[PDB]
Amino acid sequence: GAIFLEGVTVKGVTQVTTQPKLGEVQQKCHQFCGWEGSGFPGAQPVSMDKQNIKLLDLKPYKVSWKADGTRYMMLIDGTNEVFMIDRDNSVFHVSNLEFPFRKDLRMHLSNTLLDGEMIIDRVNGQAVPRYLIYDIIKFNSQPVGDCDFNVRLQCIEREIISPRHEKMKTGLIDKTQEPFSVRNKPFFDICTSRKLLEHEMDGLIFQPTGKYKPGRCDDILKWKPPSLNSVDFRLKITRMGGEGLLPQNVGLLYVGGYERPFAQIKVTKELKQYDNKIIECKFENNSWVFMRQRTDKSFPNAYNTAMAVCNSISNPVTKEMLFEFIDR
């Protein structure tokens, strides 16, 4: 959606609508991911419920703190070719980000695909953009995504953060020139995850150590404290009555890939303001509750993502309960 980062304004970053290169940057990301369908190829994590958590016993898992951020895959195809892709498949061209090849420090990266969030860090008085690299799909055409989540975590460290961090002590690369701060997200064993329950996080993520998968991953688990559970709906306000008379007018909430409305929202003075727009709602008191408009999404959550959140809110995993599952 046309806004790259919500609330922050960001240099060097300009949405790509050019008909020719758009369908291309999109094209290359499917192919790198093995994505058969249309839409954003990146792996989608599902909310932990009491049936999910049992999965943390059945194989090796890594944890990390989830900062609330905007999902972006980053395709490094060339010299000035650096693109971000959000969940909508919207593309953005980044200018001054340089990714030097590890062996030849003069040479530049091609056929690389990244995954991560854009997060807003606050250095007091001003908010600084950071892009955390939380996975890598492809490197120089080598299917690193087929390797071990620990193999790939190193790729990210050794093949990406390091070659850039050499030219960052050489004066050949100026970090005050670049659009945003490029970092990698730290992962731990579940053991130490408990301790994390004992920058800023609205929750935890649990990564299986397996090969990278695109699409819904029933096995990547997002845990979130039950009151912070939310869903992105298309809000369409329709005034209606049939022959059954009263002209009441109710806000209908919509999700992706379900045709009828998913829920209803009580109309208010304030709400009409964002209509036909996208709205993030928290669930409480047996009602969806408008919380903040979402300017970065041209699209609402998927019906399957939505149901997933409800599954979670009606059969929740409490902080303690998760604590007590990791511990012993």
Resolution in angstroms for this experimental structure? 3.0
Task: Name 160's Cβ contacts closer than 8 Å, sequence gap at least 6.
Answer: 99, 112, 114, 133, 136, 184
Q: Which residue has the tokens 């240099």?
A: 11
Is 194 annotated to bind a ligand? Reply is no
Report the first-to-last Cα separation within the chain, whole angstroms.
Answer: 44
With CA atoms as reference, report the closest residue to 220 among 61, 15, 11, 39.
61
Q: How far is CA 229 from CA 17, 135, 251, 301, in A?
A: 33, 24, 20, 13
- In the chain, what are the domains? 1-43+68-186 (3.30.470.30), 187-223+318-325 (4.10.87.10), 224-317 (2.40.50.140)
Is 296 annotated to bind a ligand? Reply is yes
Task: Name 175's Cβ contacts closer than 8 Å, sequence gap at least 6.
Answer: 168, 181
- Sort strands 126-138 and 181-184 into parallel, antiparallel or unpaired: parallel
Structure tokens at 193: 């995850």
Q: Using CA atoms, how far apart are residues 5 and 22, in angstroms rounded to an integer? A: 19
Residue 66: active-site member: yes
Task: Name 172's Cβ contacts closer than 8 Å, sequence gap at least 6.
Answer: none
**Cβ neighbours, 10 Å, residue 304:** 14
Is 115 annotated to bind a ligand? Reply is yes
Task: Name 229's Cβ contacts closer than 8 Å, sequence gap at least 6.
Answer: 47, 282, 283, 309, 312, 313
Is 297 annotated to bind a ligand? Reply is yes
Active-site residue (options: 28, 59, 62, 66): 66
Alpha helices in the chain (DSSP H): 19-33, 149-154, 162-166, 190-196, 303-314, 319-327
Would you put residue 194 in left (φ > 0), alpha (ψ -120 to 50) or beta? alpha
With CA atoms as reference, report the closest residue to 156 among 182, 130, 123.
182
Q: Using CA atoms, how far apart are residues 265 and 154, in angstroms rounded to an integer? A: 46
Q: Using CA atoms, how far apart are residues 284 and 280, in angstroms rounded to an integer? A: 13
Q: Using CA atoms, how far apart are residues 60 and 153, in angstroms rounded to an integer? A: 15
